[PDB]
């Protein structure tokens, strides 16, 4: 009942690629974590990967790395390198063999850098993936000057949208309109123009840009302003034929109802 003896012969079992007698070993040395890892690895349709997993639980990381390389499971070796914290051999494994977890590897490395207070490298490796639009606004929270500098620098037409949403929910209507106009989010332009009461320039924006959502919202505002004819016309422009025909039925514009109903959905 000596734990060192069991550990030694478990390492020997690693050397011999036999795990059935190993599986009953690292439950006798008190290594519950390793037994659980073996149980989880049993689902793999391979034998080299399972022995590599057992080696990882026994230490001997070089043997497990070589066995993963021999197994050709480059995804498992990538995860092994990430877990080991090398973060550079994992990058090369992703760039050479995975090619599908490459963006996932970039995201995980950037998260590791962020946890290590390396904000700039985290920004760079978020940029290497498509997730920076999602991550940098979260990652630069409570750092609004840096966040607006990054938003102005990148010009991603969605970082502008995110910043404009923030400014709108920060009492910054003018800057919100500026950034929405940069982001070409015509729906927000029309919405805030109607909300502020200046409906004419909203109508001009809808007419010029042709944004379907902007025209729909503007015509909804018209239908809420008791004006119907313009509301019907700008439902027609926004291809919102259902609201248009409902309004025509309400106001009894049968002649206007026909032209909308003919081209409407069945």
């Amino acid at each position: 009942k000596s734990e060192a003896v069991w550990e030694n012969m478990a390492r020997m079992c690693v050397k011999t690629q036999r795990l059935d007698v190993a599986k009953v070993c690292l439950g006798n040395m008190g290594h519950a974590r390793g037994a659980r890892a073996l149980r989880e690895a049993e689902q793999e349709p391979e034998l080299e990967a399972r022995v590599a997993v057992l080696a990882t639980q026994l230490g001997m990381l070089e043997d497990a790395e070589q066995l993963y390389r021999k197994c050709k499971r480059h995804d498992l070796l990538n995860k092994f390198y990430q877990a080991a914290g090398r973060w550079q051999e994992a990058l090369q494994v992703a760039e050479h063999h995975d090619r599908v977890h490459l963006r996932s590897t970039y995201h995980r490395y950037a998260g590791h850098l962020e946890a290590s207070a390396d904000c700039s490298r985290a920004l760079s490796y978020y940029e290497k993936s498509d997730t920076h639009r999602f991550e940098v606004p979260r990652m630069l929270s409570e750092d609004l000057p840096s966040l607006e500098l990054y938003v102005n620098k990148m010009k991603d037409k969605t970082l502008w949208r995110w910043w404009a949403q923030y400014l709108e929910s920060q009492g910054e209507m003018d800057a919100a309109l500026h950034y929405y106009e940069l982001a070409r989010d015509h729906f927000s332009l029309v919405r805030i123009h109607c909300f502020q009461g200046n409906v004419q320039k909203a109508a001009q924006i809808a007419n010029e840009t042709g944004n379907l959502a902007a025209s729909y919202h503007l015509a909804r505002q018209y239908e809420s302003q008791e004006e119907v004819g313009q509301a019907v016309h700008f439902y027609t422009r926004a291809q919102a034929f259902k609201n248009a025909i409902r309004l025509c039925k309400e106001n009894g514009l049968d002649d206007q109802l026909m032209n909308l109903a003919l081209l409407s959905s069945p």
Binding site: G27, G30, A32, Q57, A83, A84, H112
Partner: protein, 488 residues
């Protein structure tokens, strides 16, 4: 005699000296107010940035034992009763029922011994042992706790939810209304005069209890593997007549007898000094202190300074003990322990408190505690799994009678197998015959072969060879021939 100095050095506000009308008997300061008073009168001043201006000099029925200020509300304790009122009592569409109230109710024949005032609550302890929360915003009692003995003193934390109270027996407790429980403070000195909570935003659990001789630094471990508890972290001697006022990031602004504040650095928080000149033999106790205070970031910094793998393992074990999965993942990833990093990332998204507690207890090789936590979780069978993974077949059989009875046969057979390999054939026979099923033909045949071998080795040779005949497997005959050769 007639001066009160109000300052916020942490936020950089310059000290402001206010000359009051009379020599105050009690002084209290809130976010926006300063109430100084004596006997049954209390003067309120609004602490404007440039200068102050007294609003009112209010009258109270009894001798104002104490007063508390916060937000726009003031609660004055006098004659065993707390009057809670507004300060800028503007009669402008303001409901009368929320402008002033008296505690306790007229029917309650109890006296208020201690009262406090947080940003949201009016907390007070009565001579009957009752601690009651009173949500000011909604004007309703939200918590009623009944301590066995009267609560002499209460000190809420800056978060305003968790409290520390001292009763008649000088027994300090930490009270949490969220889970509604009291955890006794260990080594609470009988003659402790006051308690100051930590104000640094990232030291939630830390607080200190001071008397005229020492300042004891305690830490409340809200989330640990072994349940919530209070742990004494250290002690720091303080000079004569130094009543502490403020505690910020381990620095104590304590009031002297000259009306001048002074700064004292706590022994537990003595690491705020330079760390490059400090030797490793001095960092190791410093690292233990930082680990005890749940200061994991500073512990990481000082471990990086040490560059000793034992220190990193100490930090990581502390992180696992305190239910900090992400930081433990960080520390193990830096160390290089791949297997445990992957195991942690497997449970990274676990939300059940007891299940995660059991997982992190098993990761630290405490299987009894891990099982005890697993049974209380929402996935009890996990315990069986680890007991099955630890080859603890007796314990696995004990658990499987409740959680998974369908695994009762298989596990039992495995038990017998171990009993067979340990030479304890008597119990091996019993568990083999107890491991029989009615569906798995191969399992039943294996169990029957085991029963045959055991019965043969029991000297019950007739029955053993009887089951030997009725098993369709030549390998059983092959090994049974050797067994009979053993009995010759």
């Amino acid at each position: 005699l007639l001066e009160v100095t109000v300052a916020n050095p942490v936020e950089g506000e310059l000290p402001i000296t206010v000359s009051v009308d009379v020599e105050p008997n009690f002084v209290a300061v809130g976010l926006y107010h300063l109430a100084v008073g004596m006997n049954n009168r209390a003067w309120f001043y609004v602490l404007g940035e440039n200068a102050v201006k007294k609003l009112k000099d209010m009258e109270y029925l009894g001798t104002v034992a104490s007063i508390c200020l916060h937000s726009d509300y003031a609660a004055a304790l006098f004659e065993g009763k707390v009057q809670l009122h507004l300060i800028e009592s503007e009669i402008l569409d303001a409901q009368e029922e929320r402008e002033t109230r008296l505690f306790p109710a007229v029917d309650d024949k109890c006296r208020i011994l201690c009262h406090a005032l947080t940003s949201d609550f009016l907390i007070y302890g009565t001579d009957t042992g009752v601690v009651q929360y009173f949500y000011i915003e909604d004007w309703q009692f939200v918590n009623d706790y009944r301590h066995p003995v009267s609560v002499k003193k209460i000190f809420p934390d800056p978060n305003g939810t968790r409290l520390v109270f001292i009763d008649e027996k000088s027994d300090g407790f930490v009270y949490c209304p969220v889970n509604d429980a009291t955890y006794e403070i260990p080594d609470f000195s009988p003659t402790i005069k006051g308690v100051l909570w930590e104000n640094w935003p990232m030291d939630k659990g830390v607080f200190i209890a001071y008397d005229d001789d020492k300042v004891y630094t305690y830490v409340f471990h809200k989330d640990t593997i072994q349940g919530a508890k209070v742990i004494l972290a250290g002690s720091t001697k303080v000079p004569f007549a130094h009543k502490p006022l403020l505690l910020y990031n381990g620095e104590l602004t304590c009031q002297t007898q000259s009306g001048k504040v002074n700064n004292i650095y706590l022994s537990t928080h003595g690491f705020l000094s330079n760390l490059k000149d400090t030797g490793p033999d001095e960092l190791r106790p410093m690292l233990a202190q930082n680990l005890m205070l749940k200061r994991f970031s500073d512990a990481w910094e000082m471990c990086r300074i040490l560059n000793d793998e034992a220190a990193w393992n100490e930090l990581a074990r502390a992180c696992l003990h305190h239910m900090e999965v992400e930081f433990a993942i960080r520390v193990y990833r830096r160390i290089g322990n791949v297997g445990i990093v992957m195991s942690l990332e497997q449970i990274k998204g676990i939300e059940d408190y007891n299940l995660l507690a059991g997982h992190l207890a098993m990761f630290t090789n405490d299987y009894n505690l891990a099982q005890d936590l697993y049974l209380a979780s929402s996935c009890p069978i996990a315990a069986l799994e680890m007991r099955r993974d630890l080859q603890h077949w007796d314990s696995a059989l004990q658990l499987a009678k409740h959680l998974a009875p369908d695994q009762i046969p298989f596990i039992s057979k495995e038990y017998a197998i171990q009993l067979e390999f340990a030479g304890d054939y008597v119990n091996a026979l019993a568990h083999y015959e107890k491991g029989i099923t009615g569906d798995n033909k191969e399992h039943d045949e294996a169990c029957l072969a085991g029963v045959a071998q055991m019965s043969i080795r029991m000297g019950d040779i007739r029955r053993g060879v009887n089951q030997a005949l009725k098993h369709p497997s030549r390998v059983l005959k092959r090994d049974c021939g050797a067994i009979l050769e053993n009995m010759k």
